[PDB]
Every structure is written in C-alpha cells, then in structure tokens.
C-alpha cells in the first residue's frame, strides 16, 4: 500500500523542514551557517519525535532513509545530506561549506531560496501521496 511511500516522502520532507527550521533560526538570529561535518547533524531520532534510545527509530522511515545515504559514516551533517543520494527530490551540487550573514543579497537568503526551490517538487510528491 502507498502509506510506505508516503512515509518515505515524509522522511525527506521532515529532514528538509529541520533544515528550514535551522535556516529560519539563522536568518532571525543574524547568524551565518556551517553545513559541513563540523556543523549540525541529522542522525538524531529526536528530530523525528522518537525518544533517546527508543527502539522505534530502528524501523522508522526517518532513520532508514538517512542511515542508507551514500555519505553516511554513522553521522550525517547537513552537507553530507545536501550532497548525498538517493532521494526523490534529486540532489544539488557545488554547495559551499559555510554561508555568512550580510546586509545586501544576503547569502543565507540565497541558500534558503536554493533549498526552497528543490523542496517544491518534493511538496508536489507529498501532495500526491497524501491525496492518493
């Protein structure tokens, strides 16, 4: 049944909403972002509502479609995510490891725009597999 494919697309969209939450906080706090292996990590199950050590993560669609990413060591930074595979969003290339915060043509807003555009084809597939 399609609920497994909805869960799969929900795993992408949950992680993209975690990224957007970190970006919206950075925009609010006047902060630049570090996205490489020294930055924020996306393996922690509490990002997806499961408790610390809760064995529901072991079968969860969120941990499954993120441990099984071609950049995963056991950890996964935002860049290891934003450079990884496979995904139904496809994936970006050429992304720089830090973005500063600056007053005109602000790099974090250009980054937020870049993430937002590729998130829209994922929202189309979520609208689809939520309405089916």
């Amino acid at each position, epitope marked *: 049944a399609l609920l497994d494919e909805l869960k799969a697309l929900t795993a992408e969209l949950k992680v993209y909403s975690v990224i957007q939450s970190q970006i919206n906080a950075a925009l609010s706090a006047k902060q630049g972002i570090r996205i490489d*292996a020294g930055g924020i990590d996306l393996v922690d199950p509490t990002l997806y509502g499961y408790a610390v050590g809760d064995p529901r993560w072991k079968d969860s669609p969120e941990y499954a479609l993120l441990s099984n990413l*071609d950049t995963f*060591s056991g950890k996964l930074s935002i860049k290891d995510f934003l*450079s990884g*595979s496979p995904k139904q969003s496809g994936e970006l*290339k*050429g992304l*720089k490891d830090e973005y500063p915060f600056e007053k005109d043509n602000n790099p974090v807003g250009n980054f937020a725009t870049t993430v937002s555009d590729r998130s829209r084809p994922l929202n189309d597939k979520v609208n689809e597999k939520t309405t089916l």
Partner: antibody
Amino acid sequence: EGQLLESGGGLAQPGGSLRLSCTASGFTFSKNAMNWVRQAPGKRLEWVAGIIGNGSDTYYADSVKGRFTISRDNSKNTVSLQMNSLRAEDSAIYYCAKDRHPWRWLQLFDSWGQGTLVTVSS
Amino acid sequence: DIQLTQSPSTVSASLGDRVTITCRASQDIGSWLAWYQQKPGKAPKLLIYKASNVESGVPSRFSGSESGTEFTLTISSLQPDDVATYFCQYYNSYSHATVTFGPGTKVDIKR
C-alpha cells in the same frame, strides 16, 4: 577505460596558500564521485586516507579540518587551501581517486590519479 | 573507525608461489572488505570484493577469507609485480578507506 590526470606538481611557501587540480577524462558527476587521498612520505601512516568524502564534501580529523575547502566543476574537482595556511605536515603526495565498481559495465575503470607532489621550501 | 594490523608476509620461494597474508580488526562491521596494491613509483590498485553476504570472489591468482575479527589474502601464483598490499572499507557497500587503510606488510618475488 576512464582516465585521471593531475597538474601543478610543484611548490608552495610554508604558511602560504596552494591550489592543485584534476582534469578527469570525460567525467560526468553521478552517484559515484571523486575524493582526495594524502599519501604520506614513504610510509603509509594511519590518519592519512579518504579526505573529501564526495565531490566537494570537506572531511578529516581536526589536524586539517577547515583547510581543505575544495571547489567544483565536471573535471577540475579541485582540492584547495586557497587562504588556508599550508603546513609542513601538508607536504605529501595528493591523489585523485574515483569510486569504481566491478561487473564489466560502466564505472569498471582504473580509478587512481598520477599522484601530484607538493614541495614546501623557502 | 576500526583500527587494523596486517601480518605476516615474506619473500616468495619463486614465481608461481603461494603466500597467505592476514589482518586483525579492533572493532566490527562484519566482512566489509577490499585489498589495495601499491607497485613502487605508481598509482595504487584494487584487488578483493564482496561483503558479509560472501557472494562470488575474484578473477585470476587472487583470493581471500574472513571470520570473527580477522581477514586474509591468499595469492596462489605470486608474480614479480606483487610488491606491497593493504585493506579497506567505509560504511554503505563499496569504495573509500577506513580513515586508515590496514597498514600493509612487505612482499617480494624471488630469484
């Protein structure tokens, strides 16, 4: 089979800055990608291997972390210390590698570069 | 990641000889494996493949076997090229390095 071929096999000044290159033959970036391995002088020391996890993805121990901010292309795939204080410990041989597969189809291609040196001397 | 040690190996008796080189792992993943070969003054090369599901092995003179916390390379027709060797893997299915390779042990081919 596919080919790799480096350039800039010369010189830098200690605490200065440096930029190497690839020129990967007909390469189109994919699921499999390129990565940069630091052959140490003579002996294969432990923490050496597997810098740049995938294309532009910076990764190492803290001993170089933040220096290795690689650029992009479809062929130049450039390891780089452009403002980033090249140390005596960073004199080594830097190899392109590619994530090969067996099974006779595409990606079964000999996968290591010709090994660009880096001299440091004042 | 997993630390490794590689031993033993010595000179062949001849061309066409048999030698078996082992390694020990400080930590576990299963049999996620490959061997790299370093001819002198050259780019390194790749040897063995297939994971904990030990599907079919390697063409020509190469072979290897694993259990517990050890893995091993047997060469059954040891040739004059075959003069340094190493172990590796990183976690998904193939390529890269264990942040260290398994640090190798000399090989040489006799007259």
